[PDB]
């Protein structure tokens, strides 16, 4: 069909954060109904949230909220879509 790639409206947070603070990450697609895969530090995450970090869906928008930035979370974050792919590297420095 038409070679129109699904655009990523929100890139992943490029700024450096510190351990202990609550960081909200926003990455959504330009078209609603589309789902994505979360890739963290080379590890493919499982399809489920927890009290450490959770993601919400709303049509097109997807929000990943981490309650406390930790060394665990200091890994790279990539959002895999069939169209485009948003890749960003987060650095969580210690306190």
Curated annotation (Swiss-Prot):
<protein>
    <recommendedName>
        <fullName>Myosin-binding protein C, cardiac-type</fullName>
    </recommendedName>
</protein>
<feature type="domain" description="Ig-like C2-type 3">
    <location>
        <begin position="5"/>
        <end position="95"/>
    </location>
</feature>
<comment type="function">
    <text>Thick filament-associated protein located in the crossbridge region of vertebrate striated muscle a bands. In vitro it binds MHC, F-actin and native thin filaments, and modifies the activity of actin-activated myosin ATPase. It may modulate muscle contraction or may play a more structural role.</text>
</comment>
<comment type="similarity">
    <text>Belongs to the immunoglobulin superfamily. MyBP family.</text>
</comment>
